Amino acid sequence: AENLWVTVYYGVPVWKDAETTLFCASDAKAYETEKHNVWATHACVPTDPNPQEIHLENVTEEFNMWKNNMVEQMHTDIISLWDQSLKPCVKLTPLCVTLQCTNVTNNITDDMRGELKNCSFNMTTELRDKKQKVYSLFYRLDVVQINSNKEYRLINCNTSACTQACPKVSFEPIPIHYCAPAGFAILKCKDKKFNGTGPCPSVSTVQCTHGIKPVVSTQLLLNGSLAEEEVMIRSENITNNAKNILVQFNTPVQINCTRPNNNTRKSIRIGPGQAFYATGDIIGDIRQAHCNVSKATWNETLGKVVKQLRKHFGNNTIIRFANSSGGDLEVTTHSFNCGGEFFYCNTSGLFNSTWISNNDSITLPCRIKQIINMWQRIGQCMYAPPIQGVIRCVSNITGLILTRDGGSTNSTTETFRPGGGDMRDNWRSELYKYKVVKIEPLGVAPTRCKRRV
Amino acid sequence: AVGIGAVFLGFLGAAGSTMGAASMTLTVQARNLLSGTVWGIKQLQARVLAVERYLRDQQLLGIWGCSGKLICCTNVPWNSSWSNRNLSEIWDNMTWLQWDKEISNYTQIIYGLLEESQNQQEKNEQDLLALD
């Protein structure tokens, strides 16, 4: 009886929290179209079908969104995969030349400042002795004046020469399924009203997570994963100021974004084998890129997010949405990609309201840049080559990223302003359900049995 | 038969169940413990780590009383200072995740105890078969 003995058990379920390098999986539909059409078509494995969502009883797991793993790992993965998808494309060091620019053939009005310049310059041929006088169109956000006469140069020539993305590759997101390696498990919190920190009373283990589209949007995160019943706000500490408030709502608001010119690309041969895709002529009228959001649906979703946000600040508070406060152009404005073209769409038409305690559309304008500086590194660009035809993309805004104002002085109202900041706040809105655990076998328990000789 | 499904003993499938109930299904945790450009490299950097740590814990069973028996009657008396709680409330109430936190402080003397007990009974068995 009291002669109880140690018995080991190998292969018994207990886990600890851990960090490890995770592992891709892509769907077979992305394998149906081949030949590096988009990135990570060879760097990741084909998935298995019917992933085993296995429920567990009587389990209270402590999840944490903000000190989570799998997001700095995902961020390093996506920036390294960005870097590897530019090495075979060309380098544009022979283009930092003194450009002679002028205005485009257009009725120039003095109030409207033209976003296009017509720039002509010398460039080497594939024959090294000869040079050709070519012309192209650039955006005013890419050239800068050198000081009568007018001479321009590119914006990045005194910082870094940089790479045109070779346009056989594309930039639309394909879903990536992260998978745990052997000897690790992935837990998913199947609770509904789960704000993102603390115990989750209904967990389930998954071998490989669902489709995560990596989108790069700063505010107004697009193509995301919706909620279940409510609109959910979440924060690390809501009484803090420096931490963004992630908002994810249930029914999406669709957004139609376009640029209505048709660029005609032309190939300017730099040297042997290296070509440079410039903008030729604009046939038809020149117009401004824009985006449309349904007004009634936007007002309804802002009503829902005010009804949700009053639960954390008292019901008798006046919530006021203002536009962005300032900073660089990739955070003051809604930045995204659309069919391989980078839009920067103004956002003051949406975030402008005041809510008290009791078929039209919003058109918001955009400006597009050809030279990006994504992830803000020291010696990088990407010269996005132009796309032929008009460009239209329809997507579905699912979430928002907000920021309070750090109010003193007897303030009865709370002003909310959008703000992009980091890019990890995007994927942090998609990996909130998931924790990675190291399963460890080999438990030790006493029982009533003794080893013989 | 139609209109009916089939469930099969899933991975981690009894993590909230009782220790007496989880003590019958250990083999699925053992089966899904081994099997399942630099990116291949880094998942290679994952993969061998898996197999490395797998062999590591089996090496521990190589030193104690049982190489592959997957449960193991031993000959170390259970000190009541570790648990001081009777069997019928351990095997019929608690789950394993609670027990691991409960005796996670009391480890690393059990491992040396088991090692010494196995080596001691091994050399005694060698001396027993020696005199024949």
Partner: antibody, heavy 125, light 112 residues
């Protein structure tokens, strides 16, 4: 299989559409699949199985007596599955059940998992 | 479809006497695997059905041995050795050898 939740309109006039949703809390506790069904019971009459589907496939089985008026679908990401019925007659007044069934091999002996939701009575008038 | 007939449709029973309920199918219930696919449920008034008897003679756990099931390929009998107050309700046989699943018409044990 820990929980099944039925939903749909509680009173419907004969020209509208009967739509029912069953939300599964705790899909499956092991490898394999479950079979999820809708079953109905008219007052003082027997149980009648309307239809169902396996979690492992996208093919649904329907009772031929129902004249191909029923359409059943699913989506596991929302852990839901649905039954739609159009046209209606007073004979479709019934208590409606969602059910989940599987053979259970997790114990020392072969047993069954067999769970039913509480059901919702629907009277058409 | 296989037509399932349960007899009788309405049988009120006084507490304590034994009962036997018959069920018949238009086809054999022996399937490929050798299993006879017939379950018995009881639906007490204002409650959900609860599985009572499954393959040939086996009772679900927690159900007392007072309930017993027997049968051939097409003819089945549920016997209750001693009737108690919570046995009242509608008893159902059900086939699952083939789609559609079909239930017997039910036997209502009620207090007159």
């Amino acid at each position: 299989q820990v929980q099944l939740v039925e939903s749909g309109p509680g009173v419907v006039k004969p020209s509208e559409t009967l739509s029912l949703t069953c939300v599964v809390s705790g899909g499956t506790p092991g490898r394999g699949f479950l079979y999820w069904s809708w079953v109905r019971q008219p007052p003082g009459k027997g149980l009648e199985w309307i239809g169902g589907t396996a979690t492992n496939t996208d093919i649904t089985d329907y009772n031929p007596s129902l004249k191909s008026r029923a359409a059943i679908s699913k989506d596991t990401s929302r852990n839901q599955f649905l039954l739609n019925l159009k046209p209606l007659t007073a004979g479709d007044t019934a208590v409606y059940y969602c059910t989940s069934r599987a053979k259970d091999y997790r114990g020392p002996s072969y047993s069954r998992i067999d769970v039913w939701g509480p059901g919702v009575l629907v009277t058409v008038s | 479809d296989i037509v399932m007939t349960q007899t009788p449709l309405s049988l009120p029973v006084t507490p304590g006497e034994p009962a036997s309920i018959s069920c018949r199918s238009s086809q054999s219930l022996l399937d490929s695997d050798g299993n006879t696919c017939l379950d018995w449920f009881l639906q007490k008034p204002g409650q959900s059905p609860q599985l009572l008897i499954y393959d040939v003679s086996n009772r679900v756990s927690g159900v007392p041995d007072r309930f017993s099931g027997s049968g051939s390929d097409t003819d089945f009998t549920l016997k209750i050795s001693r009737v108690e107050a919570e046995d009242v309700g509608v008893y159902y046989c059900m086939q699952f050898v083939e789609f559609p699943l079909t239930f017997g018409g039910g036997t209502k044990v009620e207090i007159r």
